[PDB]
Amino acid sequence: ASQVRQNYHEDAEASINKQINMCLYASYVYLSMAYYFERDDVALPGFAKFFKESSDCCREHAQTFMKYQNKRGGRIVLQQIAAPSMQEWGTGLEALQAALDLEKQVNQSLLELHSTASGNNDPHLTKLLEDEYLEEQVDSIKKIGDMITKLKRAGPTGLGEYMFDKELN
Amino acid sequence: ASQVRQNYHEDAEASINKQINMCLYASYVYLSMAYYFERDDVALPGFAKFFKESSDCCREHAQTFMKYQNKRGGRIVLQQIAAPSMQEWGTGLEALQAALDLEKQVNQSLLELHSTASGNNDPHLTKLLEDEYLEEQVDSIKKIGDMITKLKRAGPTGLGEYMFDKELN
Amino acid sequence: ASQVRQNYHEDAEASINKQINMCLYASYVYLSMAYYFERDDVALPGFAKFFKESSDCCREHAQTFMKYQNKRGGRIVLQQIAAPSMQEWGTGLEALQAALDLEKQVNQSLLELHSTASGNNDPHLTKLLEDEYLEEQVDSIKKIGDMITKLKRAGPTGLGEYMFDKELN
Amino acid sequence: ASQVRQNYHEDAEASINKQINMCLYASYVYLSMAYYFERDDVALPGFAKFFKESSDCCREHAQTFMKYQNKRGGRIVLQQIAAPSMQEWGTGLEALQAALDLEKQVNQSLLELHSTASGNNDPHLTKLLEDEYLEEQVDSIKKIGDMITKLKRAGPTGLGEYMFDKELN
Amino acid sequence: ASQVRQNYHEDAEASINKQINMCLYASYVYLSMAYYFERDDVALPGFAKFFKESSDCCREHAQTFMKYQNKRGGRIVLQQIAAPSMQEWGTGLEALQAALDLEKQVNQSLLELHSTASGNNDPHLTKLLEDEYLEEQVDSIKKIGDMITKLKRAGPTGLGEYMFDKELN
Amino acid sequence: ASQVRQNYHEDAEASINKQINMCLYASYVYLSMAYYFERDDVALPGFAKFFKESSDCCREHAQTFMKYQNKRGGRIVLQQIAAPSMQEWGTGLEALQAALDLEKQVNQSLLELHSTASGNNDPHLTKLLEDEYLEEQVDSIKKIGDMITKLKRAGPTGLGEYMFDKELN
Ligand SMILES: [Mg+2]
Ligand SMILES: [Mg+2]
Ligand SMILES: [Mg+2]
Ligand SMILES: [Mg+2]
Ligand SMILES: [Mg+2]
Ligand SMILES: [Mg+2]
Ligand SMILES: [S]
Ligand SMILES: [S]
Ligand SMILES: [S]
Ligand SMILES: [S]
Ligand SMILES: [S]
Ligand SMILES: [S]
Ligand SMILES: [S]
Ligand SMILES: [S]
Ligand SMILES: [S]
Ligand SMILES: [S]
Ligand SMILES: [S]
Ligand SMILES: [S]
Ligand SMILES: [S]
Ligand SMILES: [S]
Ligand SMILES: [S]
Ligand SMILES: [S]
Ligand SMILES: [S]
Ligand SMILES: [S]
Ligand SMILES: [S]
Ligand SMILES: [S]
Ligand SMILES: [S]
Ligand SMILES: [S]
Ligand SMILES: [S]
Ligand SMILES: [S]
Ligand SMILES: [S]
Ligand SMILES: [S]
Ligand SMILES: [S]
Ligand SMILES: [S]
Ligand SMILES: [S]
Ligand SMILES: [S]
Ligand SMILES: [S]
Ligand SMILES: [S]
Ligand SMILES: [S]
Ligand SMILES: [S]
């Protein structure tokens, strides 16, 4: 095996590789949203910049897990990255609702992995999850929730959406 | 002939002179729009500044072609500059739609001239058109398209137009 | 009609629109001279720069009139700008003599505009004509007179014209 | 359809979407190599950094194409990104030889895209391919060729590979 | 053969070797003229400086073509550089007329190379020719033409030539 | 003949003209070497830099001789520059041995030029050869001798040549 591997269970190794794929996929989904909102017949630059930032964030989440896999002496296994199923995202509100569901899905998967690591008594992995993932998932979910409420107050269509988009930019 | 003229076909020379007139005319049209939107009974300073910038831009497009004509050893021939046919432009949306059509008309004429120059194998002229005209025409057209979509979302009349105008300023 | 118009006679409104067109024509004429003197077989860069600056000055003159029309509550009506009477201006001396006659003709037109404003007792308009046009016009005429005398001493052809051109540049 | 689309053939729209997917795959392949060379039992940090930068470059290449698609008025259609053909790249030399073949294949694909744009007389697209892709592609291929020659001189295994890696870092 | 070579026709490779020789020859001609104008019995330092600069420029043109040859994977083949057509260049006017004919011949050879590249569908080579050579060649020809006109007006012999020479100092 | 000429023998004047051609030829040989080591299948950037510097140095030697010819009132006579005897220079060691032989050939020719000047009692020319050519000629030969010794110790091939090349860069 690895000259560095210690207390690193095989099911944690495989779970990291699935988590890497999930964050790459979320990144792809955000990239799709970002360029949709830059279409000339959509033109919501605030939404576009917000989702482009989320795409980069998810790509770093995946690269952090890859580094971690190498740090613990496991082996990275990259899988195909599915395309987003629907690539016409509709209104800015509908995209925020989809993003909120995507982030909750990632959180649930991260909480599953913390339970896995805690069951095999891997405190190094549980610490990584608490410091680098769990806290920012909860902050993303709260931020999107706040945004949905603000957008429904302002709009959510027409002049209200145009003004909400300007705050995002 | 010219001591400097080389590989410069007469039909390119004449086409440059027509293109010079077209951009002077577009500049005039934009100047007309700019001072319309500064009327006391219109008062859309954002629209006024946007069209005044477009007027100056078109005047430089024409002066660049005049310089080019002299650089290649052809002769500049200036023609009358027709007045804009309608000088009451209506709403800010209607002026953007007219501007979008004017810019597409200029683009089509520029693409015709690239085909002319390419047919007579004038790579110096095709390069000038690609570097200095074609790329900025496509960017103008995309910018105006974006603006029309934003204005329809915000307004396009009343408080929405007033707020869109403030972003333009 | 206009909520701002006061003591602004239709006489003045129409003469201002005619003066806008006149200064735009003069600017076009100066532009034609400027690029004539940049031809490879003329190559008089000082003359070209001088006439470039006169072309810019006359365009500001026209824009100050359009701003004035809107300030007083009149309506700007643009007319076709005629092609310059000739495209080929000959020597540096012949171009200066044409500009002198062009500025004297603009000056006579402004003096007529001042006289009709005085007849209509419009002190705001006579103030504008005195401060922003009649001064500049007399300065331009004196400057061109000086240059013609200097050019005739130095040249007006050959090495003298070459030397006098370097002073303009 | 699109209020901005002009002279943009469906041929080009579809090949741009295919090229977006291709550069995203190449970026994924480069990412796999980068983290392979950071494994504790490989430990080639210069190679890892080099392939990290190539992964970032290819992702910008893909994003410039998505921006271009929106600029011209086409529609971006994302496709699944395939998993890299292998996860385990062997020696530094074998990875460079794979990257050289990957860049040559991307280059052939871009030359085909240029040829179909020329056939459709789309000078805006041929300009984009010349300035932002074909240059960089030829530079990348030359650079990788140079490194393979240098690596073969120094090593390609043992102390030579260790030394050549320090130069990349 | 070459691990980097792609889409590079043997005809382009041979034409590049010939173009390298042509610019080396022109560099040599300008060097000759520069030192001719520094003879004690000629003493035209402005002309000397102008031709020295032209000499360096052509040498840099040759070296960019040699770099290009290596970048595409062709092989540089250096040929003899012919002695300049004259040892003594007569007047400043005659030297400028010689340089104008030299730059026109170089321009013509470049346009033929462009047409060759187009026929073989080599967009990377046509791009290089459009960006690094054709524009500077047209500017260079226009500059020399301007100078010949200025020197014919000033001189072309005697005090006028002396004064024109200070312009280029 | 020359109003400046004094104590300048036609023997010296002819020898100076041959020495100019000899240093132009050596410059050309170094240029060929420089771009040979930049080939993708050679890739020795240290040697390339070294020979490109040697190329510039020999060209300045030739121009210093052309200046001197004019200073003394002799007449520069330029001949063909022969093609380099080789187009491919083998290994780095083989290039250095050819450079060593070429620098000794130039030194021997300079020493004969010094003998000529001494024979005709031209102390100004013996002073030029001592202070600007002979000392720097002896330094170049010593430096190349040093390099040959260092490269034979390090290499002369493989990793040693790769490491030696880095001290040159
Ligand atoms: Mg286990
Ligand atoms: Mg013709
Ligand atoms: Mg009235
Ligand atoms: Mg189509
Ligand atoms: Mg071939
Ligand atoms: Mg010869
Ligand atoms: S984010
Ligand atoms: S995020
Ligand atoms: S982030
Ligand atoms: S973030
Ligand atoms: S996430
Ligand atoms: S503009
Ligand atoms: S514009
Ligand atoms: S502009
Ligand atoms: S612009
Ligand atoms: S335009
Ligand atoms: S002026
Ligand atoms: S003026
Ligand atoms: S002015
Ligand atoms: S002025
Ligand atoms: S004027
Ligand atoms: S004036
Ligand atoms: S890169
Ligand atoms: S790359
Ligand atoms: S990059
Ligand atoms: S790069
Ligand atoms: S690439
Ligand atoms: S690349
Ligand atoms: S030059
Ligand atoms: S030049
Ligand atoms: S240059
Ligand atoms: S130049
Ligand atoms: S040249
Ligand atoms: S140049
Ligand atoms: S040139
Ligand atoms: S040297
Ligand atoms: S040197
Ligand atoms: S040197
Ligand atoms: S030398
Ligand atoms: S030397």
XYZ file of N, CA and C in Angstrom, chain B:
507
model
N 0.168 57.270 -61.570
C -0.564 56.990 -60.340
C 0.234 57.411 -59.099
N -0.147 56.837 -57.961
C 0.538 57.119 -56.715
C 1.896 56.435 -56.710
N 2.881 57.100 -56.111
C 4.162 56.463 -55.868
C 4.080 55.402 -54.775
N 2.991 55.341 -54.009
C 2.872 54.369 -52.926
C 1.871 53.265 -53.226
N 1.009 53.427 -54.232
C -0.070 52.473 -54.467
C 0.474 51.112 -54.907
N -0.008 50.040 -54.265
C 0.404 48.678 -54.616
C -0.674 47.697 -54.163
N -1.172 46.885 -55.099
C -2.181 45.857 -54.802
C -3.472 46.444 -54.216
N -3.900 47.598 -54.719
C -5.060 48.312 -54.177
C -6.050 48.540 -55.318
N -7.079 47.705 -55.382
C -7.952 47.682 -56.540
C -8.887 48.888 -56.502
N -9.286 49.340 -57.688
C -10.139 50.517 -57.767
C -11.482 50.296 -57.079
N -12.017 49.069 -57.093
C -13.308 48.886 -56.444
C -13.192 48.883 -54.922
N -12.024 48.537 -54.370
C -11.806 48.753 -52.945
C -11.735 50.241 -52.633
N -11.045 51.011 -53.482
C -10.961 52.454 -53.287
C -12.355 53.082 -53.210
N -13.229 52.750 -54.171
C -14.576 53.322 -54.189
C -15.399 52.827 -53.008
N -15.232 51.559 -52.630
C -15.980 51.032 -51.494
C -15.580 51.722 -50.192
N -14.292 52.031 -50.021
C -13.874 52.779 -48.839
C -14.584 54.127 -48.804
N -14.654 54.819 -49.949
C -15.293 56.135 -49.962
C -16.775 56.042 -49.611
N -17.469 54.982 -50.058
C -18.857 54.827 -49.610
C -18.927 54.493 -48.123
N -17.996 53.679 -47.617
C -18.025 53.361 -46.195
C -17.770 54.606 -45.349
N -16.874 55.491 -45.798
C -16.650 56.747 -45.082
C -17.955 57.523 -44.945
N -18.723 57.617 -46.032
C -19.986 58.335 -45.979
C -20.979 57.653 -45.050
N -21.049 56.328 -45.096
C -21.987 55.625 -44.232
C -21.700 55.892 -42.759
N -20.426 55.911 -42.368
C -20.165 56.142 -40.954
C -20.383 57.602 -40.560
N -20.110 58.547 -41.466
C -20.457 59.934 -41.193
C -21.959 60.081 -41.009
N -22.744 59.404 -41.849
C -24.190 59.466 -41.715
C -24.646 58.887 -40.378
N -24.167 57.686 -40.034
C -24.499 57.101 -38.736
C -24.129 58.039 -37.600
N -22.972 58.693 -37.706
C -22.582 59.665 -36.691
C -23.608 60.790 -36.577
N -24.044 61.328 -37.720
C -25.077 62.365 -37.738
C -26.359 61.881 -37.074
N -26.791 60.666 -37.410
C -27.998 60.095 -36.823
C -27.872 60.016 -35.303
N -26.703 59.589 -34.812
C -26.490 59.507 -33.371
C -26.477 60.886 -32.733
N -25.886 61.873 -33.415
C -25.887 63.239 -32.898
C -27.304 63.766 -32.775
N -28.145 63.454 -33.757
C -29.538 63.859 -33.695
C -30.228 63.239 -32.489
N -30.034 61.930 -32.280
C -30.589 61.260 -31.103
C -30.096 61.896 -29.816
N -28.795 62.203 -29.740
C -28.224 62.690 -28.488
C -28.899 63.972 -28.027
N -29.132 64.913 -28.947
C -29.717 66.195 -28.562
C -31.227 66.129 -28.444
N -31.860 65.145 -29.074
C -33.266 64.898 -28.805
C -33.472 64.526 -27.333
N -32.672 63.585 -26.819
C -32.835 63.126 -25.441
C -32.411 64.159 -24.404
N -31.833 65.283 -24.821
C -31.564 66.414 -23.941
C -32.641 67.498 -24.018
N -33.685 67.300 -24.824
C -34.820 68.217 -24.832
C -35.456 68.279 -23.445
N -35.958 69.467 -23.073
C -36.531 69.633 -21.737
C -37.772 68.774 -21.543
N -38.508 68.478 -22.621
C -39.686 67.618 -22.559
C -39.364 66.143 -22.798
N -38.079 65.773 -22.843
C -37.652 64.376 -22.916
C -36.798 64.037 -21.696
N -35.642 64.697 -21.568
C -34.803 64.689 -20.358
C -34.404 63.271 -19.945
N -33.670 62.610 -20.831
C -33.117 61.286 -20.570
C -31.609 61.416 -20.731
N -30.920 61.981 -19.737
C -29.471 62.219 -19.889
C -28.652 60.958 -20.122
N -29.042 59.814 -19.548
C -28.318 58.582 -19.829
C -28.362 58.207 -21.300
N -29.552 58.242 -21.889
C -29.659 57.998 -23.316
C -28.876 59.031 -24.107
N -28.898 60.289 -23.671
C -28.210 61.327 -24.431
C -26.710 61.067 -24.469
N -26.122 60.739 -23.314
C -24.692 60.459 -23.255
C -24.332 59.197 -24.046
N -25.190 58.178 -24.015
C -24.885 56.958 -24.754
C -24.824 57.228 -26.255
N -25.782 57.995 -26.784
C -25.801 58.266 -28.218
C -24.738 59.278 -28.631
N -24.384 60.218 -27.751
C -23.289 61.121 -28.069
C -21.975 60.359 -28.176
N -21.767 59.362 -27.302
C -20.588 58.507 -27.421
C -20.605 57.743 -28.738
N -21.770 57.209 -29.128
C -21.859 56.491 -30.397
C -21.611 57.414 -31.588
N -22.022 58.681 -31.488
C -21.763 59.622 -32.573
C -20.262 59.836 -32.761
N -19.532 60.050 -31.657
C -18.078 60.232 -31.741
C -17.391 58.987 -32.266
N -17.831 57.817 -31.801
C -17.267 56.566 -32.279
C -17.405 56.435 -33.793
N -18.592 56.729 -34.335
C -18.779 56.621 -35.778
C -17.947 57.656 -36.533
N -17.761 58.843 -35.955
C -16.914 59.820 -36.615
C -15.464 59.343 -36.671
N -14.967 58.689 -35.605
C -13.615 58.127 -35.689
C -13.540 56.969 -36.681
N -14.597 56.151 -36.787
C -14.591 55.098 -37.805
C -14.364 55.691 -39.190
N -15.011 56.828 -39.474
C -14.866 57.468 -40.775
C -13.474 58.060 -40.945
N -12.941 58.690 -39.903
C -11.604 59.251 -40.022
C -10.539 58.161 -40.171
N -10.754 56.975 -39.580
C -9.809 55.875 -39.761
C -9.783 55.405 -41.215
N -10.950 55.333 -41.861
C -11.005 54.979 -43.279
C -10.351 56.039 -44.155
N -10.497 57.322 -43.802
C -9.846 58.362 -44.598
C -8.331 58.222 -44.532
N -7.796 58.046 -43.320
C -6.372 57.778 -43.153
C -5.950 56.569 -43.973
N -6.755 55.507 -43.941
C -6.412 54.298 -44.676
C -6.327 54.562 -46.175
N -7.331 55.245 -46.720
C -7.319 55.658 -48.117
C -6.011 56.362 -48.470
N -5.562 57.281 -47.605
C -4.314 57.988 -47.885
C -3.117 57.058 -47.752
N -3.178 56.119 -46.805
C -2.061 55.206 -46.582
C -1.822 54.310 -47.796
N -2.896 53.849 -48.447
C -2.802 52.958 -49.600
C -2.628 53.704 -50.917
N -2.701 55.031 -50.907
C -2.505 55.798 -52.114
C -3.742 56.007 -52.949
N -4.924 55.731 -52.408
C -6.158 56.112 -53.061
C -6.538 57.548 -52.734
N -7.624 58.012 -53.338
C -8.048 59.391 -53.162
C -9.385 59.461 -52.442
N -9.417 60.242 -51.359
C -10.648 60.475 -50.615
C -11.607 61.310 -51.455
N -12.872 60.909 -51.469
C -13.919 61.664 -52.145
C -15.070 61.772 -51.159
N -15.280 62.964 -50.626
C -16.361 63.175 -49.680
C -17.639 63.508 -50.433
N -18.745 62.964 -49.945
C -20.077 63.181 -50.485
C -20.931 63.883 -49.441
N -22.073 64.415 -49.890
C -23.045 64.990 -48.969
C -23.435 63.985 -47.884
N -23.768 64.505 -46.711
C -24.199 63.698 -45.574
C -25.677 63.982 -45.370
N -26.529 63.051 -45.793
C -27.971 63.223 -45.655
C -28.361 63.453 -44.200
N -29.384 64.283 -43.999
C -29.951 64.437 -42.669
C -30.740 63.184 -42.291
N -30.801 62.852 -41.000
C -31.710 61.779 -40.559
C -33.129 62.096 -40.998
N -33.818 61.080 -41.512
C -35.140 61.312 -42.087
C -36.164 61.653 -41.006
N -36.206 60.873 -39.929
C -37.023 61.185 -38.758
C -36.098 61.662 -37.646
N -36.353 62.863 -37.126
C -35.535 63.437 -36.066
C -36.247 63.521 -34.716
N -37.493 63.073 -34.624
C -38.165 62.881 -33.345
C -38.180 61.386 -33.070
N -37.337 60.949 -32.148
C -37.040 59.533 -32.022
C -37.998 58.781 -31.112
N -38.902 59.468 -30.423
C -39.890 58.766 -29.613
C -39.323 58.362 -28.272
N -39.572 57.119 -27.874
C -39.110 56.625 -26.583
C -37.663 56.141 -26.671
N -37.039 55.959 -25.501
C -35.682 55.428 -25.473
C -35.588 54.031 -26.062
N -36.648 53.234 -25.910
C -36.676 51.914 -26.527
C -36.666 52.025 -28.050
N -37.502 52.913 -28.613
C -37.574 53.054 -30.068
C -36.247 53.519 -30.646
N -35.517 54.356 -29.904
C -34.214 54.810 -30.366
C -33.193 53.674 -30.341
N -33.258 52.808 -29.324
C -32.365 51.654 -29.280
C -32.648 50.691 -30.428
N -33.930 50.463 -30.739
C -34.274 49.596 -31.862
C -33.756 50.158 -33.182
N -33.935 51.465 -33.411
C -33.358 52.096 -34.594
C -31.841 51.955 -34.612
N -31.184 52.213 -33.475
C -29.730 52.076 -33.417
C -29.292 50.646 -33.707
N -30.016 49.655 -33.180
C -29.668 48.270 -33.482
C -29.755 47.999 -34.983
N -30.806 48.493 -35.644
C -30.915 48.311 -37.091
C -29.812 49.060 -37.842
N -29.486 50.286 -37.418
C -28.390 51.014 -38.053
C -27.067 50.250 -37.943
N -26.768 49.692 -36.766
C -25.499 48.983 -36.589
C -25.448 47.684 -37.400
N -26.579 46.979 -37.521
C -26.610 45.784 -38.363
C -26.395 46.135 -39.830
N -26.951 47.267 -40.269
C -26.764 47.750 -41.634
C -25.291 48.045 -41.916
N -24.610 48.698 -40.973
C -23.181 48.974 -41.107
C -22.383 47.674 -41.131
N -22.722 46.734 -40.246
C -22.047 45.442 -40.239
C -22.189 44.740 -41.587
N -23.408 44.681 -42.127
C -23.604 44.009 -43.410
C -22.750 44.655 -44.497
N -22.724 45.983 -44.532
C -21.885 46.691 -45.496
C -20.394 46.409 -45.263
N -19.962 46.342 -43.996
C -18.570 45.983 -43.723
C -18.256 44.555 -44.169
N -19.202 43.620 -43.990
C -18.963 42.246 -44.434
C -18.916 42.154 -45.957
N -19.744 42.944 -46.653
C -19.667 43.018 -48.115
C -18.281 43.452 -48.565
N -17.728 44.475 -47.907
C -16.421 45.020 -48.270
C -15.297 44.031 -47.982
N -15.428 43.234 -46.914
C -14.441 42.184 -46.670
C -14.456 41.146 -47.787
N -15.647 40.785 -48.269
C -15.742 39.855 -49.388
C -15.137 40.444 -50.662
N -15.412 41.718 -50.943
C -14.769 42.432 -52.046
C -13.244 42.358 -51.946
N -12.697 42.769 -50.799
C -11.247 42.769 -50.621
C -10.673 41.359 -50.710
N -11.386 40.377 -50.168
C -10.894 39.013 -50.246
C -10.909 38.502 -51.689
N -11.879 38.948 -52.496
C -11.940 38.510 -53.884
C -10.774 39.018 -54.716
N -10.353 40.256 -54.477
C -9.191 40.825 -55.148
C -7.872 40.504 -54.433
N -7.883 39.575 -53.475
C -6.724 39.199 -52.652
C -5.966 40.428 -52.121
N -6.666 41.207 -51.295
C -6.072 42.326 -50.571
C -6.023 41.991 -49.081
N -5.001 41.258 -48.628
C -4.959 40.869 -47.212
C -4.743 42.039 -46.272
N -4.154 43.136 -46.744
C -4.001 44.305 -45.885
C -5.358 44.925 -45.569
N -6.256 44.983 -46.562
C -7.590 45.524 -46.313
C -8.432 44.572 -45.466
N -8.370 43.266 -45.734
C -9.164 42.341 -44.927
C -8.724 42.386 -43.471
N -7.422 42.561 -43.234
C -6.920 42.669 -41.869
C -7.425 43.934 -41.182
N -7.327 45.079 -41.858
C -7.907 46.304 -41.311
C -9.367 46.100 -40.919
N -10.154 45.460 -41.787
C -11.570 45.295 -41.479
C -11.771 44.399 -40.261
N -10.968 43.331 -40.127
C -11.129 42.413 -38.999
C -10.709 43.059 -37.680
N -9.603 43.801 -37.686
C -9.049 44.321 -36.439
C -9.796 45.555 -35.938
N -10.232 46.434 -36.844
C -10.706 47.767 -36.482
C -12.205 47.965 -36.641
N -12.902 47.070 -37.336
C -14.314 47.315 -37.596
C -15.187 46.128 -37.219
N -14.855 44.941 -37.725
C -15.762 43.813 -37.571
C -15.959 43.458 -36.107
N -14.875 43.444 -35.323
C -14.987 43.054 -33.918
C -15.811 44.062 -33.119
N -15.637 45.363 -33.383
C -16.412 46.333 -32.620
C -17.855 46.427 -33.102
N -18.143 46.124 -34.370
C -19.547 46.092 -34.774
C -20.300 45.014 -34.010
N -19.703 43.827 -33.892
C -20.355 42.725 -33.201
C -20.536 43.055 -31.728
N -19.614 43.830 -31.149
C -19.731 44.181 -29.736
C -20.795 45.247 -29.521
N -20.907 46.202 -30.451
C -21.980 47.189 -30.383
C -23.343 46.516 -30.469
N -23.510 45.626 -31.444
C -24.788 44.953 -31.654
C -25.190 44.154 -30.418
N -24.235 43.439 -29.810
C -24.507 42.690 -28.586
C -24.840 43.621 -27.425
N -24.111 44.732 -27.299
C -24.404 45.693 -26.242
C -25.818 46.260 -26.378
N -26.207 46.662 -27.592
C -27.549 47.222 -27.775
C -28.612 46.162 -27.498
N -28.412 44.940 -28.009
C -29.312 43.846 -27.674
C -29.509 43.678 -26.177
N -28.406 43.632 -25.424
C -28.492 43.548 -23.963
C -29.338 44.681 -23.398
N -29.112 45.905 -23.892
C -29.816 47.082 -23.382
C -31.311 46.993 -23.650
N -31.693 46.569 -24.859
C -33.112 46.439 -25.187
C -33.797 45.466 -24.237
N -33.163 44.317 -23.969
C -33.734 43.337 -23.043
C -33.859 43.910 -21.629
N -32.823 44.608 -21.161
C -32.877 45.208 -19.833
C -33.964 46.271 -19.759
N -34.107 47.076 -20.812
C -35.101 48.139 -20.783
C -36.518 47.572 -20.789
N -36.754 46.494 -21.548
C -38.063 45.841 -21.536
C -38.383 45.219 -20.180
N -37.373 44.693 -19.486
C -37.598 44.172 -18.143
C -37.923 45.307 -17.176
N -37.072 46.339 -17.137
C -37.291 47.456 -16.223
C -38.585 48.197 -16.540
N -38.853 48.456 -17.817
C -39.943 49.329 -18.197
C -40.915 48.671 -19.155
N -40.932 49.139 -20.416
C -39.967 50.122 -20.941
C -40.345 51.610 -20.828
N -41.435 51.940 -20.145
C -41.858 53.321 -19.945
C -41.891 53.640 -18.452
N -42.058 54.924 -18.136
C -42.335 55.331 -16.760
C -41.144 55.176 -15.828
N -41.433 54.692 -14.612
C -40.405 54.573 -13.583
C -39.279 53.633 -14.022
N -39.623 52.548 -14.722
C -38.599 51.665 -15.252
C -37.636 52.371 -16.190
N -38.166 53.162 -17.126
C -37.291 53.893 -18.035
C -36.424 54.884 -17.272
N -36.997 55.530 -16.255
C -36.247 56.507 -15.475
C -35.080 55.842 -14.759
N -35.292 54.620 -14.243
C -34.217 53.907 -13.555
C -33.200 53.334 -14.531
N -33.654 52.789 -15.666
C -32.702 52.326 -16.671
C -31.823 53.473 -17.148
N -32.420 54.649 -17.370
C -31.652 55.811 -17.801
C -30.564 56.181 -16.799
N -30.813 55.971 -15.503
C -29.815 56.306 -14.492
C -28.620 55.365 -14.544
N -28.830 54.101 -14.920
C -27.691 53.205 -15.087
C -26.842 53.591 -16.279
N -27.465 54.106 -17.335
C -26.728 54.527 -18.518
C -25.873 55.759 -18.254
N -26.179 56.513 -17.201
C -25.513 57.779 -16.921
C -24.355 57.617 -15.930
